[PDB]
Amino acid sequence: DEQQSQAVAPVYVGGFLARYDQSPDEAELLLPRDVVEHWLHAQLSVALPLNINHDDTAVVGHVAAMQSVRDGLFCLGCVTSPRFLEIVRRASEKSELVSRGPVSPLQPDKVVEFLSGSYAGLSLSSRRCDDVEQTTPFKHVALCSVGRRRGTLAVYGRDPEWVMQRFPDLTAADRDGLRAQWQSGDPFRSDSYGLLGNSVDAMYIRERLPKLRYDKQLVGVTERESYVKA
Amino acid sequence: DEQQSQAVAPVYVGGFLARYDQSPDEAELLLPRDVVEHWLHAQLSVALPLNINHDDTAVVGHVAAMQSVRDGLFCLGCVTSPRFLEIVRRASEKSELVSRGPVSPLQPDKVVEFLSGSYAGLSLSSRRCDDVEQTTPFKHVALCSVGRRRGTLAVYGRDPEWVMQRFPDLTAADRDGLRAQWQSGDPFRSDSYGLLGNSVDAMYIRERLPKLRYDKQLVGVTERESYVKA
Ligand SMILES: *[C@@](O)(C(=O)NCc1ccc(I)cc1)[C@H](C)NC(=O)[C@H](CC(=O)n1cccc1)NC(=O)[C@@H](NC(=O)CC(C)(C)C)C(C)(C)C
Numbered sequence: 001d002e003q004q005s006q007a008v009a010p011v012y013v014g015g016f017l018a019r020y021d022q023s024p025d026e027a028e029l030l031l032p033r034d035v036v037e038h039w040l041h042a043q044l045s046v047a048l049p050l051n052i053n054h055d056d057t058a059v060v061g062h063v064a065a066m067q068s069v070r071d072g073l074f075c076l077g078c079v080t081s082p083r084f085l086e087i088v089r090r091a092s093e094k095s096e097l098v099s100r101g102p103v104s105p106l107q108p109d110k111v112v113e114f115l116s117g118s119y120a121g122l123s124l125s126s127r128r129c130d131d132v133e134q135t136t137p138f139k140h141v142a143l144c145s146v147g148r149r150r151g152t153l154a155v156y157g158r159d160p161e162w163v164m165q166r167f168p169d170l171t172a173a174d175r176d177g178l179r180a181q182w183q184s185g186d187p188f189r190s191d192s193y194g195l196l197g198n199s200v201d202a203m204y205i206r207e208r209l210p211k212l213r214y215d216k217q218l219v220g221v222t223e224r225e226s227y228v229k230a
Numbered sequence: 231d232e233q234q235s236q237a238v239a240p241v242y243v244g245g246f247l248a249r250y251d252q253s254p255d256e257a258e259l260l261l262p263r264d265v266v267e268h269w270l271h272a273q274l275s276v277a278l279p280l281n282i283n284h285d286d287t288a289v290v291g292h293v294a295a296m297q298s299v300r301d302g303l304f305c306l307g308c309v310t311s312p313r314f315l316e317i318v319r320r321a322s323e324k325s326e327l328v329s330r331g332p333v334s335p336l337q338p339d340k341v342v343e344f345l346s347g348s349y350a351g352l353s354l355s356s357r358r359c360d361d362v363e364q365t366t367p368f369k370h371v372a373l374c375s376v377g378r379r380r381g382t383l384a385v386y387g388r389d390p391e392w393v394m395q396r397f398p399d400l401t402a403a404d405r406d407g408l409r410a411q412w413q414s415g416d417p418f419r420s421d422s423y424g425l426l427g428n429s430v431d432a433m434y435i436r437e438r439l440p441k442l443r444y445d446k447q448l449v450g451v452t453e454r455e456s457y458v459k460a
């Protein structure tokens with residue numbers, strides 16, 4: 001009864017929403033450093049919502065921190081939704097992937113390990129950044145199977161310090177900026193059928209796994225350790 | 231109110247459980263023509279159950295027919311489980327893949343479409359057929375994302391005459407022998423959560439889609455039309 005309450009505790013997510021050194025597969029995915037910065041400055045006020053694959057009825061949390069760093073944009077969000085966390089707790093109990101558990105030194109975390117296999121990537125939702133122009137341009141972040149912009153792997157953890165330390169690229173100064181940022185109840189308006197449904201979409205996205213390893217290597221989570229299942 | 235029950239109708243499925251013209255990856259997948267022949271005769275008595283990825287607590291229906299055709303072993307099963315169908319019904323309403331509908335002349339069938347994307351493969355549970363020896367050897371058949379055996383694509387539809395028609399290899403005599411075969415209530419002991427968990431396991435099988443595409447070409451559904459999402 002308490003173990004279940006232990007797993008249902010808040011989960012933290014962090015990742016690059018965009019790695020400046022990467023050329024998109026689609027022109028509309030262009031988000032330059034000068035643009036990010038200007039936008040970041042124009043907006044942070046209220047906390048952007050964190051949702052499941054951009055669905056407005058699947059808000060699981062909020063983004064706690066946003067920070068343009070040398071290699072791209074970084075975000076730190078927190079999954080605080082009781083219902084979502086419970087759905088994940090329940091479902092994790094039924095996955096053979098989760099069952100195999102993490103890599104040695106890491107302790108099992110069914111909920112974190114579930115979100116990590118499923119929603120292995122972050123995806124920002126923002127203003128149309130098109131040639132010749134560059135308020136609230138950042139709309140929301142979305143947890144999804146993969147991202148359209150490479151290098152947006154999602155690192156899940158129970159401690160914002162822990163997840164942050166997973167990315168070799170970040171620097172003390174970076175983490176400071178972020179930390180300083182984090183320093184009506186349950187927003188989820190969907191359910192297990194809703195997420196079961198979403199599960200099929202992700203299953204037809206071409207080269208998802210190959211993208212995720214590319215992302216893993218790129219961001220460096222390879223040369224570290226987490227519950228990344230990709 | 232009835233469109234719902236219109237979708238909750240039985241869904242059939244057909245597909246090869248093994249193509250004698252395919253070298254297996256793992257030796258334990260050897261299912262020679264002669265062996266199949268033999269077993270089939272020794273065994274069809276009670277109807278093998280039809281389950282989700284071999285979970286015994288996830289039986290969706292039963293296998294109505296199995297036949298050793300020239301190119302392999304074909305089977306025809308029927309998803310009858312009310313509970314499962316409803317879970318797959320409410321989930322389909324949340325899928326964007328299914329939202330895009332099927333190919334032109336075909337009618338949108340959310341449940342049949344959901345099953346096509348998710349449970350895209352057909353997997354046999356059988357006795358250990360190893361070199362030296364060749365009652366009831368056929369345990370059951372399972373609906374899963376991919377098959378360890380190639381050419382085991384799962385074609386779904388509301389009518390068994392149609393699903394059988396999707397396969398260019400089946401002769402009239404074939405369709406005859408299968409047709410002759412089909413001519414405690416809800417066996418489902420699981421739920422959305424149990425199905426949600428299974429989704430992630432599917433999400434980590436490497437080379438799945440490309441396997442499925444190879445499945446579709448080999449068996450022929452490529453040169454026909456169905457709800458095959460792959
Ligand atoms: C993000 O990674 C994503 O959604 N990935 C899922 C995905 C994986 C694989 C495949 I194939 C397809 C999808 C991705 C980078 N984000 C976007 O595409 C966002 C999506 C939304 O914002 N969105 C809102 C409601 C439904 C989708 N796209 C954008 O942010 C675009 N911006 C806009 O359209 C302006 C508005 C609508 C956000 C106000 C731009 C990419 C143009 C910035």
Ligand SMILES: *[C@@](O)(C(=O)NCc1ccc(I)cc1)[C@H](C)NC(=O)[C@H](CC(=O)n1cccc1)NC(=O)[C@@H](NC(=O)CC(C)(C)C)C(C)(C)C
Nearest residue numbers: 258284352353354355356357358369374376377378379435
């Ligand atoms: C089937 O396609 C399958 O399971 N596909 C899903 C899958 C996708 C990707 C990956 I990587 C792995 C799996 C596959 C051909 N069938 C099997 O593997 C069955 C599974 C079971 O029998 N099974 C029973 C309980 C849980 C699974 N394996 C067999 O049929 C083996 N037979 C036996 O183990 C004997 C018993 C247990 C059935 C009595 C043989 C492969 C040895 C025949």
